[PDB]
Amino acid sequence: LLEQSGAELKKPGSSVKVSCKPSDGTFRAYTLSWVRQAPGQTLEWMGRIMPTVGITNYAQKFQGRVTISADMSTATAYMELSSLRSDDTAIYYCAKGPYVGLGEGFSEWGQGTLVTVSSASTKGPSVFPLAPTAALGCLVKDYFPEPVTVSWNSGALTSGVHTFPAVLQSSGLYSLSSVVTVPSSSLGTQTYICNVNHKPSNTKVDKKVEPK
Amino acid sequence: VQLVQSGAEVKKPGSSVKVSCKASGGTLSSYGISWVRQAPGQGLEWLGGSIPILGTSVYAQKFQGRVTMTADESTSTAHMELSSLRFDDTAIYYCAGVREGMAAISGKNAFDIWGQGTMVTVSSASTKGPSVFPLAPSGTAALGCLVKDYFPEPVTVSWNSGALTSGVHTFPAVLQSSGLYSLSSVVTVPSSSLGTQTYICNVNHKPSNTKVDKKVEPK
Amino acid sequence: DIQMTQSPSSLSASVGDRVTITCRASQGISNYLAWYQQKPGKVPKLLIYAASTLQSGVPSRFSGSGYGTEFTLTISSLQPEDVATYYCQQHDNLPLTFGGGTKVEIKRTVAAPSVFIFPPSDEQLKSGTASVVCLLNNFYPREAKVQWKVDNALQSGNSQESVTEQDSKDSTYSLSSTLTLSKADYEKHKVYACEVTHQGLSSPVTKSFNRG
Amino acid sequence: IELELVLTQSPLSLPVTLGQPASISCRSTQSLVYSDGNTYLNWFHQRAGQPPRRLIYKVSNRDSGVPERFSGSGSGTDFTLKISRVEAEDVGIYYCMQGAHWPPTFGGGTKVEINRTVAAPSVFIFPPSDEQLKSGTASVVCLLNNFYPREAKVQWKVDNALQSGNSQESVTEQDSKDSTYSLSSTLTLSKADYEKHKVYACEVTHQGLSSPVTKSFNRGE
Amino acid sequence: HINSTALNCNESLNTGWLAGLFYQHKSSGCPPCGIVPAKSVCGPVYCFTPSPVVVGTTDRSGAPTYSWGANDTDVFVLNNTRPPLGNWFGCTWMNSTGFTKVCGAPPGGPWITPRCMVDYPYRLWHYPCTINYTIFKVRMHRLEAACN
Ligand SMILES: *[C@@H]1O[C@H](CO)[C@@H](O[C@@H]2O[C@H](CO)[C@@H](O[C@@H]3O[C@H](CO)[C@@H](O)[C@H](O)[C@@H]3O)[C@H](O)[C@H]2NC(C)=O)[C@H](O)[C@H]1NC(C)=O
Ligand SMILES: *[C@@H]1O[C@H](CO)[C@@H](O[C@@H]2O[C@H](CO)[C@@H](O)[C@H](O)[C@H]2NC(C)=O)[C@H](O)[C@H]1NC(C)=O
Ligand SMILES: *[C@@H]1O[C@H](CO)[C@@H](O[C@@H]2O[C@H](CO)[C@@H](O)[C@H](O)[C@H]2NC(C)=O)[C@H](O)[C@H]1NC(C)=O
Ligand SMILES: *[C@@H]1O[C@H](CO)[C@@H](O)[C@H](O)[C@H]1NC(C)=O
Ligand SMILES: *[C@@H]1O[C@H](CO)[C@@H](O)[C@H](O)[C@H]1NC(C)=O
């Protein structure tokens, strides 16, 4: 309903621009806010723009280094945050609120954009099988930054899937596992593929896990 | 009381033309000046127009990227500039308005005062002045003037500085095979006054700034 | 864009006839329609404003009517000075848009032309060219035919004609044909004649001259 | 003079058994009635890996599609989000927000967990693949699938040697379907150390098991 | 942006009327926002945050339109909540017959103080009784005001 820009890795001191696109393709009588959430922090409201009239309001903590623009004809709102510090690593949401102003909160939300502010390099993930009701899985190792998304088959296998949160290894690289429990009588016939892609590294893998 | 426009010009394709429109004895802003052009032998087409409630002029989208309209109240003069001229822009350009301050501030106007019009010719050919030759006569007699080899249009002919009107026929210009225009103007007069009365044709070709007064006599 | 469709293209009537010009609109424009008269060589004059309000100094024979999409300009008694193209313009919407226009001409009694022939001036002969002019004056109908004969030899492709618009006082036309020759070919022949054929002439009229 | 407004939510963790009522309070340091006479306090429910979702706006007005079990009440500085009957779907974090003071702020958040019946985990162990051994590292994974409560102990053994400190665990959020947890433990070893030993096992201790369960594999087969 | 202005001005509102509008100063006869249909609006519509803001024609959903307000679905969404957290205090515009309309509440006509009004391009046309007013700077938001 509110398509949002993809995840990004940005170095400290640079600037990141996050886009927000309504599925209509046209702006209407509603205000567009930007809310972020840093790890271990509560939701933080940043700014506000009426794409129809052009009024922009920003929160004092971000006054000076945030700028919210809206490009009509494209019908895509933007948020730019310059002078990126380490603690700006957060999930950035755009949220639709009432035209009349703030108060009732936000009735619709984007999916979120994870902005990682770090000087480390982008590293593609390595995918390895977890071979065998029976349990079957995929190990996604040594990638940076977050996130990595995993689906099974091609979105067809959703029941019994567990994609674990990524953990931060002592090397600074991430790793996660995705596992699925399946009937034992299905191992001999059905096929199972992990759909692992990492956006920052343009690495898309389709590992087929087979028992041995 | 009157809107007076600039003179006819010839402009090369891709160039620009500026046309003026001076409102004698009036505040230029009260007339709601629009610009309407008329291609040779065709209809009327509304370009931009003044909108008092906005205090500026707005243009039809057909011309939005290449026409601008200005107005100078200190000189009672309105201007229209048309850029990137194509062959399709050859027309007579009229400034128009409505008098006695009855112009709708919406700009949605019917116009009861019109300038005399300004023909702009988009062409690569050079301006050339005409030659004037007499059509000498030999109970009514006919005499006239032959205005030959001029470019571009138009040429205007009067007789006796506008004092002779009844009996005058100024024909439409014809385009010769050389790319130049030709025109003739005749008048029927009583045969008894051929020796006593003076008949002068006043020729004016503004693109070349050529003015001729040719007295036509028999023999 | 509101579009104005005006009928007919061309119109012919007789002095004293009712003439009706129709103008249709692509949207409802209430009564915001004007009518202009434009006699040849002149600027447009505003006759009717707001569909039916007659302008000051306009003969009572002109009237307008209509509301919505279809409008009619009617001339109760057609007069010689009424011959010109008539245009309708909507003033309800921007951009202001005009109709194609209706050319109004007059049928009147047949009138033969008065033919005059003009030798080239001696000023023109000094420049190397020769123009012979034949003039048909105040005739009706417009259909006419001129032929040039040089030493009784018919000439083709060496002349051009030009016709005035219909006169506002006597509803006649006038024509001028011009025969162009070089100075060398002019001095070769003696008799220069202009043979005129018209409905009002029982027999073709010929006006001629000899060099000298 | 403009003073910092603070929203406090209590409790910070609200464990509730399935089918029982629950209430979450949001208290403000300043009254939330606005110039127009409205009280702009709202409530948001966030699921795992999903953006927040509004449940209540203006204290008590329920949002469309929000189950009737949710209701809000209070006035001025005290407010309460009440759930009549708690379902497994209602797991997640609940926030309050205020729109009567500049700038708009969100509460700290309350984490609701559902107490269901005990459920022993099913334990699975996966040897590292030959692809990973072709590099320099070997990762052995132990999976504890669908259990409640979260209290679980995983003990790695490599040829009966207790492994300590070289294993990282990861738990999913409480499942919005069956209210269970899933965990994965990862033992990291070098290729040299992996070939040095044959028997690999993880010992799983949980309340739903009659005794510690041990899944093992041999490096050969 | 510019063709989002409603041009629904009556014929009676001509240039002569507009000339004498801010010419009348030499004076004995002087002193809830929602969806306004564009058919009754002549000229730009201004709302004040307290700073002046133009609100152009939209459809009923709020999608901007650019047809001079000529369409019969064109409206002005002027719904407002107080502008600390809302959008604007109130709005002002001239309707088809030439009368100034207001809605909402003044920011403290759009009056900041009992004698000072927010200054905006159409102040002299919407409020001619304030032609002899002097213009002062105001910091509330940096804007300009017109006072006695
Ligand atoms: C409302 O007003 C806006 C602003 O003037 C109009 O946008 C303008 O529309 C014209 C006509 O479509 C555009 O002209 C185009 O320009 C390009 C680039 O110069 C040219 O290559 C094309 O051939 C075309 O002529 C113009 O660019 C555009 N201006 C802007 C700033 O976007 C709009 O059309 C108006 N809409 C209505 C419904 O009246
Ligand atoms: C300007 O206001 C006048 C006065 O109300 C309007 O004139 C009316 O127009 C309607 C529609 O054409 C007629 O049905 C009424 O009979 C007219 N009233 C009078 C007293 O003549 C006019 O339409 C308005 N113009 C615009 C552009 O809104
Ligand atoms: C423009 O605004 C004026 C002023 O409010 C309106 O005129 C009023 O119209 C009602 C119609 O019932 C009358 O009762 C009032 O007496 C009128 N007031 C004055 C001062 O005359 C007018 O109707 C509005 N026009 C449009 C098109 O909205
Ligand atoms: C504006 O208010 C009207 C009622 O007056 C309502 O129907 C409409 O939905 C509101 N629109 C907005 C954007 O607030
Ligand atoms: C007027 O609005 C309607 C929508 O109600 C639209 O379909 C139509 O095209 C519009 N007309 C113009 C001329 O823009």
XYZ file of C-alpha atoms and ligand atoms in Angstrom, chain E residues 39-41 95-101, ligand 3:
38
model
C -17.602 26.579 -8.667
C -18.065 29.374 -6.091
C -14.398 30.421 -5.872
C -16.248 33.902 -4.005
C -17.859 34.200 -7.436
C -19.767 37.418 -6.622
C -16.769 39.183 -5.062
C -17.405 38.620 -1.351
C -14.563 37.579 0.925
C -15.217 34.305 2.743
C -20.971 34.749 -2.623
O -21.020 35.230 -1.304
C -22.145 36.075 -1.039
C -21.975 36.598 0.369
O -22.235 35.603 1.350
C -23.443 35.297 -1.238
O -24.509 36.234 -1.150
C -25.502 35.819 -0.203
O -26.396 34.898 -0.809
C -27.468 34.438 0.034
C -28.301 33.507 -0.817
O -29.439 33.023 -0.120
C -28.274 35.615 0.591
O -29.195 35.136 1.565
C -27.356 36.651 1.225
O -28.104 37.803 1.594
C -26.270 37.050 0.243
N -25.390 38.052 0.824
C -25.210 39.262 0.282
C -24.275 40.177 1.012
O -25.777 39.601 -0.754
C -23.479 34.637 -2.612
O -24.588 33.746 -2.695
C -22.190 33.867 -2.895
N -22.180 33.385 -4.267
C -21.762 32.163 -4.611
C -21.828 31.832 -6.073
O -21.352 31.360 -3.779
